[PDB]
Amino acid sequence: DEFPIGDEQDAGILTVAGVYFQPVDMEPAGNSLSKNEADCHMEADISANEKGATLGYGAGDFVPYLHVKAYIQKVGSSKVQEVAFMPMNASDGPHYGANVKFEEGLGKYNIKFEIKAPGNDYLLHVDKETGVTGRFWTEPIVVEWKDFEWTGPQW
């Protein structure tokens, strides 16, 4: 069903897995390509690790209200494709994802996920009685997988 982009990675309070599988139909359609126009669905599985308790997250919890963008670059190429992910549910639960088309065809790509904190959408209790001790990250978190091979559908 699901194919890893690479090994799972910890970054700050986040645990970030990247997977891909067949392109999907989404309701509403969102920002990404239609199923027939796409090569795959790409998905960032983002959850809190143990350090997330500093912001009030339980370990393993989905972290919502993030802003996630993927950068897809053919190795040796002068151009990078930028793809906004949206939050969504599949049968396997919440994630950030998008239908994606590899613009340079089958080959070796570098894949980066850029993960921005919630900002003014999501609040934090900061008082001592009920509050958390941590604060959201200010610089976007970057997870990168080198030498991902896109070899067409595996489904």
Add this chain to the structure above:
Amino acid sequence: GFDEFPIGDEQDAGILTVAGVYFQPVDMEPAGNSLSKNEADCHMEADISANEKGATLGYGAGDFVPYLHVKAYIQKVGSSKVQEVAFMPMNASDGPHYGANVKFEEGLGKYNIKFEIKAPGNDYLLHVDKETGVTGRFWTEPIVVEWKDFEWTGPQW
């Protein structure tokens, strides 16, 4: 880790399990839409999670349901005045919830408290293909949960 006071009993509505609590007003960063700590009577919280029926939408039982739009309507019983207060999603030491600092504008006594829970709309997508998708669908009109004759008795803190 801190004292929480009940608004009635936990209620199920659609795929949601909804409980209300309140406690001392809090400091929020950023401040959001609601009253400041020193201007409010309490912090009011809606704890919204998926029940067993939430699996139809791909939610795990008990998990927080994000991207909802939650508003509270607070009406003193016998009064025509209805206060409306938007809740925002946020984390406290006990985890995610929707909440706001609120003021009971008509003083001590009986209030009807309604939580109006709008579905995410264009903010949250659903896979709907057969292979990876879900067969449940979000609600067009808000889910409403109400506790009648909640008693505001003043701060214990």
